[PDB]
Amino acid sequence: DTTQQLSLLKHVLSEDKRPIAFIIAAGCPVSIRHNDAPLIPDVAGLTRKISDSFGGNPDSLLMKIIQNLKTTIPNPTIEDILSYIRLLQQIPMSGKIHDVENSVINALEESICELIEEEVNVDLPGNATPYHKIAAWINSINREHQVEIFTTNYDLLMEQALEELNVPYFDGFVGSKRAFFDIRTIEENKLPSRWSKLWKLHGSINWQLDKQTQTIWRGTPSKGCSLIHPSHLKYDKMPYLVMMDQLKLFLNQPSAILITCGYSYKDQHINEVLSQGLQTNPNALIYGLQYDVLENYQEAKDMALKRSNLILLAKDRAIIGKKEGEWKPDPQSSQDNDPLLFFKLGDFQHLASFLEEISQ
Amino acid sequence: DTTQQLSLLKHVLSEDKRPIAFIIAAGCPVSIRHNDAPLIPDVAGLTRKISDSFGGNPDSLLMKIIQNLKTTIPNPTIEDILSYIRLLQQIPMSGKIHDVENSVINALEESICELIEEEVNVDLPGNATPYHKIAAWINSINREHQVEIFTTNYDLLMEQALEELNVPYFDGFVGSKRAFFDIRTIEENKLPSRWSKLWKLHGSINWQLDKQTQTIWRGTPSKGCSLIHPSHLKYDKMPYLVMMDQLKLFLNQPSAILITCGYSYKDQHINEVLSQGLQTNPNALIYGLQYDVLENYQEAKDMALKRSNLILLAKDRAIIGKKEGEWKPDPQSSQDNDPLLFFKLGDFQHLASFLEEISQ
Amino acid sequence: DTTQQLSLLKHVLSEDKRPIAFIIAAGCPVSIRHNDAPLIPDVAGLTRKISDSFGGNPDSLLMKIIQNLKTTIPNPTIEDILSYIRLLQQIPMSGKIHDVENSVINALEESICELIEEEVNVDLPGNATPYHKIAAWINSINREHQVEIFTTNYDLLMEQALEELNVPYFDGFVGSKRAFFDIRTIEENKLPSRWSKLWKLHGSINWQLDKQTQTIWRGTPSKGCSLIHPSHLKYDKMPYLVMMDQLKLFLNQPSAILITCGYSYKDQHINEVLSQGLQTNPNALIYGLQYDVLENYQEAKDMALKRSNLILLAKDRAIIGKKEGEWKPDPQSSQDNDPLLFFKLGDFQHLASFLEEISQ
């Protein structure tokens, strides 16, 4: 099964007559090895470090909120914690819910934001990162269709990799000192064909908001960024709707190609937008790749079974057109002991190596 | 004479069938009044403050260099001082020329650069600045020909004014984290017609250079910028040649229009490039405006007399096609005492008011 | 002033070469007289009846919420009350804010919704209502441009009036048993030219939501409707964004005409959308009519002064192109005593009579 999938992926990627896009999750930064430790500990690591930062004392309001979410949500998420904190802040919640912190909830959320900014403020070491290989593949061959990249992370690894290898791109912000969010050019869609596009679905650490004019602008990491929200803010001083509209418009392009890397399909809004776009345009294709086993993603199974034009692949099994298949009998492991048939090519490092081989 | 000149300027500016460009010098920032003091004291003010920073002690090497330049150059310039310092640094000049500072010349030039960065790092107060009026005039009417702006200053006032009023522009740098200097798109000249262009002839304070790859990039003001040179650097890690080539190419466009504001025509390279472009394309026009009297600019007189398609205007007299004329008898001053016929409309504030009136 | 305004309104309404639209507020239902009492007591009447339903006892949580809003909002609104209740419900707010009702807030909001449904569930008596006259005017002359109607109310008076007089229309829902919200046909915009359109900005009482599929559908009034929200719900299982997008797209049509009836311009979102649409397309016109005096609407004055293509009219004065004018000296009142110059033609009954006269 590996040979056929590799051949078809090579054939579809070699052709320049179809648009290409990617989805970037925490799996891509976590795949980088540094001092035998992950570069970014992902959402789970950030939640564990956030919990350990304030200690195990139950008197802290953070632990009370965590256990309150545990009562409702079996596995709380830092995104959910931030959403709940902002929801509490949106109203004068001075009651028993915030009895421990009558007004220190703002201080707690500011501290959380500062910790996030400090922990995610790193840089790519050297030129051996998979991002450099991706950029080299992108700029190796000129394509008539622009290549866009979608990411839900906060780190600027992709931007640094693209700018190091001389890859022009447009992120929606135009300017030098305080780049503002221009709207007209986004829907004009008349950029030069050699330019690429990078859309920040969940925002970035360098985005800031000014309350004097209530306007957003892209700058440099300062003491507290106002656009750290995981898609939870006010109405449209909010570019999330524009990004979702652009994603939907891309999904409507004929013969669209999209690849998900490191995404666990655990976001309801992204999943529903992808499903609606796939249903609206049957020609759209999704070559989803999961580093973990298929059994851990029931939502991925449901999405694959719901639409016949979603070729989902995993480490063990795959779903190609509403039918589930397993690994064919092949000598995947040379050792006789534990002959596990695992698709190790789904890793970010293996994907980067495959893309580099395709480019050369 | 005022009425005819105003009418012809209004007619030529109202038409959208010809390209428009501007030249920005220290006159534009010096025209802004703040606390009854100039916002930027211009080159002369910077030289005086630089001299006063180290005091009047002759033992300092800076005063020795100043007097050495005085022996040759009757009026030393901070640009000339920087050029001389860089020329000394380019060779192991450990002799009597640098006897006072055997190796402290680097420290002296770093201190000068830091002082320049600190003194020119300001922001536009309010929205009443002439730059806001210029941006409003630019974005008021959509034009089939893009409007470019040329500046030799280091401050980012124009960028802030353009971004505040939602004016997209292209400055040659593309990127988000560390925008690199893309070359191909500059000569492609296939940008959208609604976009504007801002070219930095003398560089900017936010430009930086990395010696690991010897590459330039536009970022944010850090402790010491490597592109503070007034057009005095190495060979082409130098975008000055590209900017001059773009200016020359603009001068070759049919029916080109260009306006100089605050320029004293004291740069040999800019003057020779303008003269060559005007000679190559007779259709090019230069509506030079000087805030000072005509008698103080002999180079302007020579340039105006050398070419018949350069309509030079001053505070007292003007040269329209190699002939010099004076102010016609008109009641310019209501008071009988001192009936000086001065063209007060040449000031930056008056120019901004005129442009605002034209826009409305 | 009355004659010129009437003549220009007749001329613009007689022409069939421009699109026509209307905005319907509580003023239209309140203008119907029944038993010498208003048919619908509008937002203020609904708030008074809601307050009187639970009595003056301070122990009730509803009065506590009302006084809490009074501390912040000088004049609480039932829409604001519903928004605050839903905001409290969105999080486990079991604290002092909901100390009186630890879990009875759901019962309180269900009771409020049931009371709203019961009070707004009426029918048009006879055929003498102004809605019948509006429908007769609409269907009297075939027009090349479809006539759309926008309403923020919950009653179905317009639907009944249109269906009684055999006026086909499209409201976004397609189906017979459980009409679903079709999306594609909304943006297709290829409906027959004789069809009309009625968009529900604030929803309707017959809309329902199923949580099994989390899907909305238009049906019949049942025991509790899930789409009673005054534009306050979850993300896009929400058609409000589609309605706003359609309104904005209509505002972009050349030579667009729009009339506001009974609207007090007290909604920030509607006002900002209208302002943005008017600024984007200068050809758009807004013939706003207010039954009350101009002095009670400061937001209307600000909107009229902000844009030069908004002809606002009131009972006493008017603003035609950023300038405010008063009533010209005319014998508006025959009686000498109290010669008040009031534009009585701005009433809904008078407007219906004028439209009927224009039709015949």
PDB file of N, CA and C in Angstrom, chain A residues 166-221:
ATOM      1  N   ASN A 166      14.666  33.342   0.883  1.00  0.00           N
ATOM      2  CA  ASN A 166      14.223  34.320  -0.109  1.00  0.00           C
ATOM      3  C   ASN A 166      12.922  33.872  -0.780  1.00  0.00           C
ATOM      4  N   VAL A 167      11.888  33.725   0.041  1.00  0.00           N
ATOM      5  CA  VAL A 167      10.563  33.329  -0.428  1.00  0.00           C
ATOM      6  C   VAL A 167       9.585  34.453  -0.112  1.00  0.00           C
ATOM      7  N   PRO A 168       9.196  35.269  -1.089  1.00  0.00           N
ATOM      8  CA  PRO A 168       8.203  36.313  -0.823  1.00  0.00           C
ATOM      9  C   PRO A 168       6.850  35.718  -0.468  1.00  0.00           C
ATOM     10  N   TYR A 169       6.132  36.417   0.408  1.00  0.00           N
ATOM     11  CA  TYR A 169       4.835  35.941   0.866  1.00  0.00           C
ATOM     12  C   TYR A 169       4.012  37.126   1.345  1.00  0.00           C
ATOM     13  N   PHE A 170       2.700  36.910   1.416  1.00  0.00           N
ATOM     14  CA  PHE A 170       1.751  37.924   1.859  1.00  0.00           C
ATOM     15  C   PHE A 170       0.917  37.343   2.990  1.00  0.00           C
ATOM     16  N   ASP A 171       0.909  38.026   4.136  1.00  0.00           N
ATOM     17  CA  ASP A 171       0.216  37.546   5.324  1.00  0.00           C
ATOM     18  C   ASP A 171      -1.009  38.386   5.666  1.00  0.00           C
ATOM     19  N   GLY A 172      -1.382  39.323   4.798  1.00  0.00           N
ATOM     20  CA  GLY A 172      -2.542  40.152   5.054  1.00  0.00           C
ATOM     21  C   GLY A 172      -2.209  41.523   5.604  1.00  0.00           C
ATOM     22  N   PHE A 173      -1.012  41.683   6.157  1.00  0.00           N
ATOM     23  CA  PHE A 173      -0.591  42.959   6.721  1.00  0.00           C
ATOM     24  C   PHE A 173       0.360  43.674   5.773  1.00  0.00           C
ATOM     25  N   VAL A 174       0.125  44.971   5.585  1.00  0.00           N
ATOM     26  CA  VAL A 174       0.925  45.806   4.699  1.00  0.00           C
ATOM     27  C   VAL A 174       1.407  47.007   5.498  1.00  0.00           C
ATOM     28  N   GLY A 175       2.702  47.258   5.463  1.00  0.00           N
ATOM     29  CA  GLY A 175       3.274  48.387   6.167  1.00  0.00           C
ATOM     30  C   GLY A 175       4.684  48.073   6.620  1.00  0.00           C
ATOM     31  N   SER A 176       5.331  49.101   7.160  1.00  0.00           N
ATOM     32  CA  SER A 176       6.706  48.994   7.628  1.00  0.00           C
ATOM     33  C   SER A 176       6.839  49.238   9.124  1.00  0.00           C
ATOM     34  N   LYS A 177       6.350  50.376   9.618  1.00  0.00           N
ATOM     35  CA  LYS A 177       6.439  50.670  11.044  1.00  0.00           C
ATOM     36  C   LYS A 177       5.358  49.926  11.821  1.00  0.00           C
ATOM     37  N   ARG A 178       4.092  50.177  11.485  1.00  0.00           N
ATOM     38  CA  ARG A 178       2.945  49.513  12.105  1.00  0.00           C
ATOM     39  C   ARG A 178       2.034  49.058  10.967  1.00  0.00           C
ATOM     40  N   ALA A 179       2.291  47.857  10.452  1.00  0.00           N
ATOM     41  CA  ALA A 179       1.514  47.346   9.331  1.00  0.00           C
ATOM     42  C   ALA A 179       0.059  47.153   9.738  1.00  0.00           C
ATOM     43  N   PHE A 180      -0.846  47.779   8.995  1.00  0.00           N
ATOM     44  CA  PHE A 180      -2.266  47.655   9.277  1.00  0.00           C
ATOM     45  C   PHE A 180      -2.865  46.498   8.486  1.00  0.00           C
ATOM     46  N   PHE A 181      -4.081  46.116   8.866  1.00  0.00           N
ATOM     47  CA  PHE A 181      -4.783  45.002   8.234  1.00  0.00           C
ATOM     48  C   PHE A 181      -5.602  45.548   7.072  1.00  0.00           C
ATOM     49  N   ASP A 182      -5.018  45.529   5.876  1.00  0.00           N
ATOM     50  CA  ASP A 182      -5.732  45.953   4.680  1.00  0.00           C
ATOM     51  C   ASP A 182      -6.730  44.879   4.271  1.00  0.00           C
ATOM     52  N   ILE A 183      -7.946  45.298   3.940  1.00  0.00           N
ATOM     53  CA  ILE A 183      -9.040  44.379   3.646  1.00  0.00           C
ATOM     54  C   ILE A 183      -9.277  44.244   2.148  1.00  0.00           C
ATOM     55  N   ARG A 184      -9.203  45.356   1.412  1.00  0.00           N
ATOM     56  CA  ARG A 184      -9.570  45.344   0.000  1.00  0.00           C
ATOM     57  C   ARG A 184      -8.685  44.398  -0.803  1.00  0.00           C
ATOM     58  N   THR A 185      -7.368  44.467  -0.586  1.00  0.00           N
ATOM     59  CA  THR A 185      -6.447  43.649  -1.368  1.00  0.00           C
ATOM     60  C   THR A 185      -6.660  42.161  -1.122  1.00  0.00           C
ATOM     61  N   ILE A 186      -7.189  41.793   0.047  1.00  0.00           N
ATOM     62  CA  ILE A 186      -7.429  40.384   0.343  1.00  0.00           C
ATOM     63  C   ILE A 186      -8.458  39.805  -0.619  1.00  0.00           C
ATOM     64  N   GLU A 187      -9.555  40.528  -0.846  1.00  0.00           N
ATOM     65  CA  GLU A 187     -10.576  40.063  -1.774  1.00  0.00           C
ATOM     66  C   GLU A 187     -10.290  40.447  -3.219  1.00  0.00           C
ATOM     67  N   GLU A 188      -9.335  41.348  -3.464  1.00  0.00           N
ATOM     68  CA  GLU A 188      -8.958  41.647  -4.843  1.00  0.00           C
ATOM     69  C   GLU A 188      -8.380  40.418  -5.528  1.00  0.00           C
ATOM     70  N   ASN A 189      -7.516  39.680  -4.826  1.00  0.00           N
ATOM     71  CA  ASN A 189      -6.913  38.449  -5.337  1.00  0.00           C
ATOM     72  C   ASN A 189      -6.229  38.686  -6.684  1.00  0.00           C
ATOM     73  N   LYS A 190      -5.419  39.740  -6.742  1.00  0.00           N
ATOM     74  CA  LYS A 190      -4.666  40.091  -7.941  1.00  0.00           C
ATOM     75  C   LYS A 190      -3.188  40.245  -7.617  1.00  0.00           C
ATOM     76  N   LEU A 191      -2.706  39.470  -6.647  1.00  0.00           N
ATOM     77  CA  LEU A 191      -1.296  39.470  -6.313  1.00  0.00           C
ATOM     78  C   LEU A 191      -0.495  38.763  -7.405  1.00  0.00           C
ATOM     79  N   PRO A 192       0.800  39.059  -7.516  1.00  0.00           N
ATOM     80  CA  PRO A 192       1.631  38.361  -8.507  1.00  0.00           C
ATOM     81  C   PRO A 192       1.639  36.858  -8.264  1.00  0.00           C
ATOM     82  N   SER A 193       1.665  36.100  -9.364  1.00  0.00           N
ATOM     83  CA  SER A 193       1.529  34.650  -9.280  1.00  0.00           C
ATOM     84  C   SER A 193       2.706  33.982  -8.582  1.00  0.00           C
ATOM     85  N   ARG A 194       3.866  34.639  -8.526  1.00  0.00           N
ATOM     86  CA  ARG A 194       5.018  34.042  -7.862  1.00  0.00           C
ATOM     87  C   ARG A 194       4.978  34.215  -6.348  1.00  0.00           C
ATOM     88  N   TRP A 195       4.107  35.081  -5.840  1.00  0.00           N
ATOM     89  CA  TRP A 195       4.002  35.300  -4.406  1.00  0.00           C
ATOM     90  C   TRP A 195       3.254  34.157  -3.730  1.00  0.00           C
ATOM     91  N   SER A 196       3.634  33.880  -2.485  1.00  0.00           N
ATOM     92  CA  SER A 196       2.949  32.895  -1.671  1.00  0.00           C
ATOM     93  C   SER A 196       2.068  33.598  -0.639  1.00  0.00           C
ATOM     94  N   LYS A 197       1.321  32.809   0.131  1.00  0.00           N
ATOM     95  CA  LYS A 197       0.412  33.344   1.136  1.00  0.00           C
ATOM     96  C   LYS A 197       0.504  32.510   2.403  1.00  0.00           C
ATOM     97  N   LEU A 198       0.547  33.181   3.551  1.00  0.00           N
ATOM     98  CA  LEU A 198       0.557  32.527   4.857  1.00  0.00           C
ATOM     99  C   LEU A 198      -0.538  33.156   5.710  1.00  0.00           C
ATOM    100  N   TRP A 199      -1.548  32.367   6.059  1.00  0.00           N
ATOM    101  CA  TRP A 199      -2.693  32.847   6.822  1.00  0.00           C
ATOM    102  C   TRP A 199      -2.617  32.326   8.251  1.00  0.00           C
ATOM    103  N   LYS A 200      -2.796  33.223   9.213  1.00  0.00           N
ATOM    104  CA  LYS A 200      -2.733  32.895  10.635  1.00  0.00           C
ATOM    105  C   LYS A 200      -4.158  32.694  11.140  1.00  0.00           C
ATOM    106  N   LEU A 201      -4.576  31.431  11.231  1.00  0.00           N
ATOM    107  CA  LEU A 201      -5.938  31.129  11.663  1.00  0.00           C
ATOM    108  C   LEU A 201      -6.166  31.523  13.117  1.00  0.00           C
ATOM    109  N   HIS A 202      -5.196  31.252  13.987  1.00  0.00           N
ATOM    110  CA  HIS A 202      -5.329  31.521  15.412  1.00  0.00           C
ATOM    111  C   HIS A 202      -4.562  32.760  15.858  1.00  0.00           C
ATOM    112  N   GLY A 203      -4.118  33.595  14.926  1.00  0.00           N
ATOM    113  CA  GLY A 203      -3.385  34.789  15.282  1.00  0.00           C
ATOM    114  C   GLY A 203      -1.892  34.549  15.403  1.00  0.00           C
ATOM    115  N   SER A 204      -1.211  35.556  15.948  1.00  0.00           N
ATOM    116  CA  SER A 204       0.235  35.511  16.105  1.00  0.00           C
ATOM    117  C   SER A 204       0.623  36.295  17.350  1.00  0.00           C
ATOM    118  N   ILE A 205       1.848  36.055  17.822  1.00  0.00           N
ATOM    119  CA  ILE A 205       2.332  36.722  19.025  1.00  0.00           C
ATOM    120  C   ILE A 205       2.727  38.169  18.766  1.00  0.00           C
ATOM    121  N   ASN A 206       3.010  38.532  17.515  1.00  0.00           N
ATOM    122  CA  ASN A 206       3.416  39.889  17.184  1.00  0.00           C
ATOM    123  C   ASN A 206       2.245  40.806  16.860  1.00  0.00           C
ATOM    124  N   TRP A 207       1.030  40.273  16.765  1.00  0.00           N
ATOM    125  CA  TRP A 207      -0.139  41.116  16.558  1.00  0.00           C
ATOM    126  C   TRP A 207      -0.468  41.877  17.837  1.00  0.00           C
ATOM    127  N   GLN A 208      -0.877  43.135  17.683  1.00  0.00           N
ATOM    128  CA  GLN A 208      -1.250  43.968  18.815  1.00  0.00           C
ATOM    129  C   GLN A 208      -2.501  44.757  18.459  1.00  0.00           C
ATOM    130  N   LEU A 209      -3.203  45.216  19.492  1.00  0.00           N
ATOM    131  CA  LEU A 209      -4.432  45.978  19.327  1.00  0.00           C
ATOM    132  C   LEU A 209      -4.325  47.278  20.110  1.00  0.00           C
ATOM    133  N   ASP A 210      -4.760  48.370  19.491  1.00  0.00           N
ATOM    134  CA  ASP A 210      -4.808  49.681  20.126  1.00  0.00           C
ATOM    135  C   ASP A 210      -6.263  50.016  20.420  1.00  0.00           C
ATOM    136  N   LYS A 211      -6.559  50.287  21.693  1.00  0.00           N
ATOM    137  CA  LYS A 211      -7.923  50.593  22.104  1.00  0.00           C
ATOM    138  C   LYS A 211      -8.300  52.043  21.837  1.00  0.00           C
ATOM    139  N   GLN A 212      -7.322  52.910  21.566  1.00  0.00           N
ATOM    140  CA  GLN A 212      -7.639  54.295  21.223  1.00  0.00           C
ATOM    141  C   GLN A 212      -8.464  54.360  19.945  1.00  0.00           C
ATOM    142  N   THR A 213      -8.081  53.582  18.936  1.00  0.00           N
ATOM    143  CA  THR A 213      -8.863  53.432  17.719  1.00  0.00           C
ATOM    144  C   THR A 213      -9.462  52.041  17.583  1.00  0.00           C
ATOM    145  N   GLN A 214      -9.193  51.143  18.534  1.00  0.00           N
ATOM    146  CA  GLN A 214      -9.666  49.759  18.488  1.00  0.00           C
ATOM    147  C   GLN A 214      -9.265  49.089  17.174  1.00  0.00           C
ATOM    148  N   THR A 215      -7.997  49.252  16.809  1.00  0.00           N
ATOM    149  CA  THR A 215      -7.484  48.743  15.544  1.00  0.00           C
ATOM    150  C   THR A 215      -6.328  47.789  15.800  1.00  0.00           C
ATOM    151  N   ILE A 216      -6.226  46.771  14.953  1.00  0.00           N
ATOM    152  CA  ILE A 216      -5.190  45.762  15.074  1.00  0.00           C
ATOM    153  C   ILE A 216      -4.060  46.090  14.109  1.00  0.00           C
ATOM    154  N   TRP A 217      -2.853  45.654  14.463  1.00  0.00           N
ATOM    155  CA  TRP A 217      -1.697  45.869  13.607  1.00  0.00           C
ATOM    156  C   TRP A 217      -0.615  44.856  13.958  1.00  0.00           C
ATOM    157  N   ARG A 218       0.169  44.488  12.950  1.00  0.00           N
ATOM    158  CA  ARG A 218       1.251  43.527  13.111  1.00  0.00           C
ATOM    159  C   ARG A 218       2.542  44.274  13.418  1.00  0.00           C
ATOM    160  N   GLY A 219       3.165  43.935  14.541  1.00  0.00           N
ATOM    161  CA  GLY A 219       4.402  44.576  14.937  1.00  0.00           C
ATOM    162  C   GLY A 219       5.447  43.597  15.424  1.00  0.00           C
ATOM    163  N   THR A 220       5.982  43.845  16.616  1.00  0.00           N
ATOM    164  CA  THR A 220       6.984  42.991  17.226  1.00  0.00           C
ATOM    165  C   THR A 220       6.537  42.580  18.624  1.00  0.00           C
ATOM    166  N   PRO A 221       7.013  41.432  19.126  1.00  0.00           N
ATOM    167  CA  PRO A 221       6.576  40.972  20.452  1.00  0.00           C
ATOM    168  C   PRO A 221       6.874  41.975  21.555  1.00  0.00           C
TER     169      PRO A 221
END
